[PDB]
Design a protein around this ligand. Structure first.
Ligand code: CA
Ligand code: CA
Ligand code: CA
Lengths: 323, 324
């Protein structure tokens, strides 16, 4: 169930069947991060520059890098020759006044254009509430079907990122949401693992908020280590596709411990698409110090970060070739 | 160019001996505008669905295929002649008249896969296009059509792209001012969307002239000689090697027929029609004012006469897409 060219592209995005990909398609989120030191709005040059510094210096240690076509094409051209390229296809964000969080592709892009821009994968982010409005989810399923069809035609892997939410729960970090997160994550993965959607890799959240798991929690506890472990097994059971974890609302150190726990519990996850934590500090150094200092930062603290992550992946991730 | 095995079989189911004699009734906004002329209340779902089912049942025995919309036309699709193929529209009807961009938008709960699953032998999509218009608008439009063309390649189903031209700065398509640029708008738009990257299998296009302003056809101001108009058809033939078929644009049945004759005499090797209002227009007033049965009798007499006389003209004017 993988064409010759999709297989070749998958291999360019991984090392020995493990995806160790660097996520840096942030647009508005990165922009705000940037305005936290300088005065005056951040220029398009700064957005594209730091993306090129991070890409040039850290992709030698990542199997691939996820970039956005709007700001990231220059960064994409200075990436390491041994690192694949994924390009984001979705517009960022969502309308906070509505609960539908409907998906929308970038206006002047298509899967064909993403492939022409050098990408080895189309990445699209979908917000999904399995329990939400039935017609909203019908429109969302139709939308992904189109993108899956596009990616089949262009013979390019389709990486579908799913971020769960609840139309009623405002705060995804609340204990209230944590009680349903396993239901949201795993049922969404079941939906979009159906063949009609054409997905090659699922980029998903871990099916639990570890900050409420015993031994990992700084405060209130809602789950035993055994209840959390079963969520990871339920997740493994929810899809036969390769899937990789994103890092959300946790520290670098907790994310790594989570990878250990995930593997311990029996999850056969196939890697990560992690970003902010690795190139975090470079954002402040870049605005304040000279870009030559952000370089040395990336060559030292930057390398240390992604290297320690790689050492953990080597003992937790499973190769997607097993599937 | 080439057709996959499945795409060719679908094209065969839409055609007879390589000629597309297709009946178009995916009208929605245009249909509601017609029904509104004949009654006070607003048209109901049941009225739209029924009138489409009547045209389908009564006239598809005389067509090689029928084009319907998924919103109101699926019941009509199920009563078409056993011998007739099916195309389904994929675009939302109409455009925003408060801006000049007329951006395309797919039906929200449909996809090429779902159109195929609904029994269609082709996906039809209408695009409003002004070759001379805003360049960023047109880049967005071109990207959109690339997506649809890719979907149809993946689902292995013919892509029928309809192009209706306009000018961002000319309000009335029927005016002499627009008539003077129409050939440019049509022919260059056909040249763009014949590029391989758009995955089009058949173009549904306007004739590249407003015949009401051509010598011999014009009742008022004459803007073009016959040789000038004929050259516009030759330019159109030279703007693509894809199959293309003409839409009627709601002219009279007689004018559309005479335009097809003129097109063939001029050198256009067009491959058929997707003809709607020129065939069934008069049934709307009858259906509204007199009801379903009276509309059946109109379709069986005047409606039949329009499509039969059209079929006779196609037999002596259209060129086959197979023999290329
Ligand atoms: Ca630890
Ligand atoms: Ca060509
Ligand atoms: Ca030609």
């Amino acid at each position: 169930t993988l064409t010759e060219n999709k297989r070749k592209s998958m291999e360019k995005l991984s090392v020995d069947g493990v995806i160790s990909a660097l996520a840096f398609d942030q647009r508005g989120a990165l922009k705000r991060m940037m305005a936290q030191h300088q005065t005056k709005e951040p220029t398009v040059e700064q957005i594209e520059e730091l993306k090129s510094l991070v890409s040039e210096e850290l992709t030698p240690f990542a199997s691939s890098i996820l970039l956005d076509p709007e700001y990231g094409l220059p960064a994409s051209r200075v990436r390491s020759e041994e690192a694949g390229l994924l390009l984001a296809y979705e517009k960022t964000g969502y309308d906070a006044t509505t609960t539908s969080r409907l998906p929308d592709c970038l206006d002047v892009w298509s899967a064909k254009r993403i492939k022409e821009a050098g990408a080895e994968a189309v990445k699209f982010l979908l917000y999904y509430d399995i329990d939400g409005d039935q017609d909203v989810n019908e429109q969302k399923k139709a939308y992904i079907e189109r993108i899956g069809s596009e990616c089949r035609a262009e013979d390019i892997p389709f990486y579908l990122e799913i971020l769960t939410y609840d139309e009623k729960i405002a705060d995804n970090a609340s204990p209230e949401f944590a009680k349903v997160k396993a239901h949201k994550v795993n049922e969404a993965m079941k939906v979009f693992s159906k063949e009609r959607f054409g997905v090659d890799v699922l980029k998903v959240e871990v099916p639990v908020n570890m900050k409420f798991v015993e031994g990992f929690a700084d405060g209130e506890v809602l789950f035993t280590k055994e209840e959390a472990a079963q969520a990871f097994r339920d997740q493994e059971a929810s899809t036969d596709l390769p899937y990789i974890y994103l890092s959300a609302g946790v520290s670098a150190k907790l994310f790594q411990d989570t990878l250990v726990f995930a593997a311990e519990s029996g999850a056969k996850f196939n890697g990560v698409l992690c970003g902010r934590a690795t190139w975090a500090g470079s954002v402040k150094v870049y605005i304040e110090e000279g870009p030559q200092a952000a370089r040395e930062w990336l060559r030292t603290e930057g390398f240390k970060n992604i290297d320690e992550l790689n050492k953990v992946l080597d003992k937790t991730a499973s190769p997607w070739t097993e599937k």
